[PDB]
Symmetry: D2
Subunit: 451 residues, 4 copies
């Protein structure tokens, strides 16, 4: 329909970069997009291109591909794509992507605000490919190291970012004034579960479970631990994927509970509300996160809850005896022990009540969420630049971490993205404010240059 906008120019890796971004998921992608738009005279009247590079450990752009369950839907309006809430005229809107694919009229006839996760990933992939010249894939960042252009001074004014090539194992280094860490989360596992190849986090569902359970027709016993959106999607999907299997949903809560996207509550995810949340005290922020927990954690989309309920009711129609059901839910349970050294294909899972019985399974899917602390390890050698006494990174409103002013130049800095819920609200790890935040980040990072 139209031509794609001009590509960003790559930078030789031996040159000092203006910005180096760790990760090229949605959060980094939104920053690339906002930078493109900011450098677009059509979009910004005022609009040399900044020297920028993105390091991504995956071999190409992918969005949670381990959980790309068939049928899985976005839990957010497509209007909250990577550009529209910042500038609906952007070439990087979902609607413009659809138009470019010749699909916009057909999507309109769906009357849905919620694309398949598959389609939304391809949207983001389609955006991502327009930045290929400035993204280095298959590069896993392993550390950020402070640098001094004047080694005999006591002022840091750049950082060296070292990454391991995931194919060759070789170590590269790139130097930059500013670093963004946007690396999402790491799998959270209950500390009571032993390491076993049959015990698999939800994040590796689509990738590593079919490797373990190769025959989709075989009568497997498969359990799912958890009662959030991932637990539900996996529990529901196993029933299609392995149709002769016996599945068990194990949860410490009494029920799957619906996610709250009711319109007054949902305004906590508005981009303008980040100022409001950020400015509250630590205590009020903690109470606020708790009060709105049903919008984000340990909750399932009502539609999916209802579909699973109907499936269970259909089992009840066929057999009033719940102990005989092919697919069962076991609420208010916790796993107290996992026998997993026996000769059998199966582990023995021992269960008790979760208030203050055994299953034998071929695999246990563990849908217990994510931690967002992995940036700490990347930043270990830059900790000493923090103000005296700090043992945590303190991100400012504009997401730049606080550093000792007498140790670090004002031209140099490190920003965090996607790990700042404590300071910036429940929207921080989601897609909800990426469009606007990208804009804010470009302004924060490239502000002098673009003025």
């Amino acid at each position: 329909l139209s031509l794609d906008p001009p590509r960003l120019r790559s930078t030789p890796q031996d040159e000092l970069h203006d910005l180096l971004c760790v990760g090229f998921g949605p959060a980094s992608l939104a920053i690339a997009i906002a930078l493109h738009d900011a450098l677009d005279p059509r979009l910004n009247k005022s609009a040399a291109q900044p020297k920028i590079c993105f390091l991504e450990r995956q071999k190409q752009f992918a969005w949670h591909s381990g959980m790309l369950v068939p049928g899985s839907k976005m839990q957010i309006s497509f209007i909250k794509d990577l550009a529209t809430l910042r500038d609906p005229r952007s070439s990087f809107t979902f609607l413009n992507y659809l138009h470019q694919k010749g699909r916009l009229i057909h999507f309109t006839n769906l009357s849905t605000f919620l694309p398949a996760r598959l389609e939304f990933e391809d949207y983001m992939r389609w955006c991502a490919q327009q930045f290929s010249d400035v993204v280095a894939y298959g590069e896993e960042v392993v550390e950020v190291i402070p640098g001094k252009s004047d080694p005999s001074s006591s002022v840091v004014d750049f950082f060296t970012v070292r990454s391991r090539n995931v194919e060759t194992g070789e170590i590269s280094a790139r130097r930059t004034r500013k670093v963004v860490i946007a690396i999402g989360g790491t799998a959270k596992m209950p500390s009571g579960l032993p390491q076993d190849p049959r015990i698999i986090h939800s994040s590796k569902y689509c990738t590593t479970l079919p490797a373990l359970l190769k025959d989709k027709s075989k009568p497997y016993n498969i359990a799912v631990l958890g009662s959030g959106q991932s637990a539900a999607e996996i529990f529901h999907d196993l029933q299609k994927r392995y149709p002769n299997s016996r599945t068990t949903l194990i949860m410490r809560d009494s029920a799957m509970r619906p996610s709250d996207d009711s319109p007054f509550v949902n305004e906590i995810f508005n981009p303008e509300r980040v100022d409001k949340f950020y400015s509250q005290s630590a205590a009020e922020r903690q109470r606020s996160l708790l009060a709105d927990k049903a919008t984000a954690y340990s909750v399932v989309r009502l539609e999916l809850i209802e579909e699973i309920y109907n499936d269970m009711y259909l089992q009840r129609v066929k057999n009033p005896d719940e102990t005989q059901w092919q697919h069962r839910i076991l609420p208010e349970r916790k796993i107290t022990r996992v026998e997993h050294h026996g000769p059998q294909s199966r582990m023995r899972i021992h269960l008790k009540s979760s208030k203050p019985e055994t299953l034998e399974v071929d695999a246990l899917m563990v849908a217990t969420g994510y931690n967002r602390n992995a940036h700490e390890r990347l930043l270990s050698k830059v900790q000493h630049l923090r103000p005296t006494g700090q043992d945590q990174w303190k991100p400012h409103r504009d997401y730049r971490v606080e550093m000792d002013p007498s140790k670090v130049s004002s031209e140099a800095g490190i920003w965090l993205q996607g790990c700042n819920e404590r300071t910036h609200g429940l929207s921080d790890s989601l897609l909800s404010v990426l469009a606007v935040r990208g804009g804010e980040m470009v302004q924060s990072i490239f502000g002098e240059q673009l003025e």
Copy 2:
């Protein structure tokens, strides 16, 4: 279509009754209905009629008539009427009521499980009228007094129930072996608000607000305190009822939140789950009530939340300046003081944040819920019959309160209904289990007689 079933026979008030029920709301009505069905040879094979009387302070049957807001809907499936979950063959089902009115086919074409509150009240009224011979209306019960058929013994074996005729003020007494107290709740007011005729509880909305604000066209300022279903219904309704008024919703929470009727959670209201809840410890029961709070308290029907949100959005369309809106919501506020002695028509309401500004209004609707402690006052003179040391009534699973066995005959007793959430679960004060509980109560109370 069919004839109504045989009426129950009245009892002369000077005779010793088998059962005397205080209140003829839904809970008592469900007991009348279950008794009728139990005495129906068509419904119960095994089926002299028990001597029974109901005392109701209203002049005729009415169901929360002060909150019969136009458009107001049931928040419960009609299948949970006063008989169906006990016996769908009962003549007292909602569907059979519709058939009797010649309306069943038209209701079917609505495709709704949720009747207007108006229609459901008329259903219950239609049931209630079939018990007119055994209900004494306009009788307000004021005390229950222990009696001894042998005054020189130390055993109580009946109770005298005294009521005040609401029209004549005259005091009547009726004697009975067994008493049921089913009197619902009393208005809960925040203790910080002064008594004023302009400050009116939600329960008296339809009755006493139009008496105060007589001219529906006048530009009143009207506030609503609270963020539950009643606050919402009243806030929304005032906008139709007084179209030129300026309304303000004052709430200490940050948002109206949706009621949870998602299907797995909603099973806590199943009749069979009362056994389960009752048998849990006090501590587990407390934690359970807390965990499922969003099913019952401080929550609004999503549909109503969404309609109010749309109304506010339409105001935003007309004027981006929220300070100028005719109808406004003020979240995270508490009332710190109410000036109400000035010469003006209006009170001055002083507001502060509810985290750890003034309105001038013609009336303040206070939608802050109910207490369920009024039975305590009726039972003051029977307290001494409790086991030594008890300062609260302890209802058994079958809702009969515990009494000292050496002080009270096994043929005599007092049952509580609708005030037992602490011991019987969130369904206790609702319509949810009335059909089944009525059956259980008839069995508990009339069990010997019906065997």
Copy 3:
């Protein structure tokens, strides 16, 4: 929960029956149920049992088992079950069935008026089994023959009904004063299609297609002709059932169109509207059937249309080239020729526009509806009893066919059920008015006896 009501007594087959019913599908079942209720003193105050028998060719009760597609839903509110609109107190209501199965509370939490076809069939099966003593299964009726108790007179006053035992092939005869023919429809095939085992009517989908296509993993090509509810259900289901197959929906219309159950239109299915429809002239009845055609024929449930549309859109997401899609719709087409004598597994289907290209397929499902003329063949030897000149059976309002009064006794007669759309409206072949019609039929047939 309760006990089942008393069984009806069987009749020795050599005795003259009061009523003999051909078929024990829903329509006959509704008559059995209404008769039971009419003989129930609990339900009818006024209430020797009539001598009745039902002849059904299937070996046991089954409801369209060839189209019991997984997930398939009722297209009618459960309130229009086989008794409720006549008498909601009946033991044969859907809700009472649920209660008897201990499932009523769980069904309530579905919040649906539309059961799975599987569940509704089991409801009807559960009803049907209560009449086992008076139903002879595996009996295919082949003719109805006039009888004269006085052979030398010219008055017919009974009929002999002869049936072929489907297992033994043996012929039985039973004599009766009154006959009901309630045998539903026969498969309508386009006259241009040749007989071939690979060409299968929708009615035999679940039974005879898996016999033909034994391996569910094989890449079959399967076509579906038609664009009604059956075509849609089969088209959608093949995609799950044979996941590697290539399916093609062939339709002469341009689109699947949604069924109209909007509430004002839907009142044509009200039981009371049959009087209104019946009394209109032939011309007005014809125009009326045409005007409301979108309620009944060549239409699909919006929900199913939307799901199929989403599946096609998902194919579009993966591949913009519709010619490469696994599952395709070909609108405005007609089949002009079917090569089916070649050596290949597959038939060659030749297509042209349907306005005034070839597929090779392993099977063609033909979803082109039903005829309702099979009663004509059963009644061939009784035609001469019609009034002079009639070449069609003329059913009165009460569904008794017109006969020459001087040739047939007033105590003898034949009623038609389910084939009377022309005279009684679009509800005649559906479940919509079975409850009320059953009552009317019992009154019409057994009226003298029950007075």
Copy 4:
């Protein structure tokens, strides 16, 4: 948020224009917008401005303001605004309008594709105001007259457009090579109804009914003739607007029927389908319009049908006697005579069945649709330029009417918009394809200039 794009320059009215557009409703507005975008180097790489003027008879931009009923909703996805389907990057998209108003995030939380008609009008108004320099309001075009730059030749190469200033009555003339007529429809009245100020077309509902019925509290009798979307909206609205009135919906059909926007059917409104429709024969086009009639004419939005049905059911709850209802529907009726010369405030409306009774009313709203023939009158003096024998204007695919090539220069022409259903399909008079058609029109009209 961003600045508005550059304004188009006005043209002195004594200059020969490139394009003169009659009407500035949605269709003309979409052409203005597409022209702006085509001249935008940001949107079109290749991008002297054409000399253009729009003549609109209203004093300012308004969209069907006589039917801007409170609550009225768009019946089309906002994605089908005036630019998005052509170019989602356009500054004239609905989403960009929302962003400019600071409302985009709040609209997102509505989760609706269907704005209030009020909001969508303000969207279009907001677009329209950006073309104020080239629109002359209060100008009613009365004729288009052929011109010859060489009067002694036989070739027309311009047209003079004459308009009457609606305030001063003065006549202006403007000359142009090309003319677009985009003037929408004129009120269709049944020819059997007499002229009376109490008989008012739906198009003048919000403007001229409250002038007639000044007191909203008065017990008026008001009838509505028709059963389409307008009849329904007016019938429903009168009940709020005049709460003590008795309203009557008079319709020749038996029921309000729902509009078909089911997704396969709805593809007839796709912009790409205009090529397909246009190329079909006259006969096939006629049959096609008939087949899809339920998408466009004599149909009501299911949601509105359902709301009206619920209102009627609520009347039934209060009173089983339909003859006493405040608001009544009278189906299958036609008006045979209107007494309207009597002394009373009210007309007497005589009714009969519509198959092949009197009301006395204060006003009759006539909701019987529109004609689209008014361009004929404007073009009367240019008819002779058509090819010999034509008595109708024949619009080409690109909407330019056919003219004799030897009588009219190739640089001169007349285009029709919004009146071409017969040749271009059911989307022609709607908003459905305005975005794309605007683009096509700009290309058709300004094609040489923009190359």
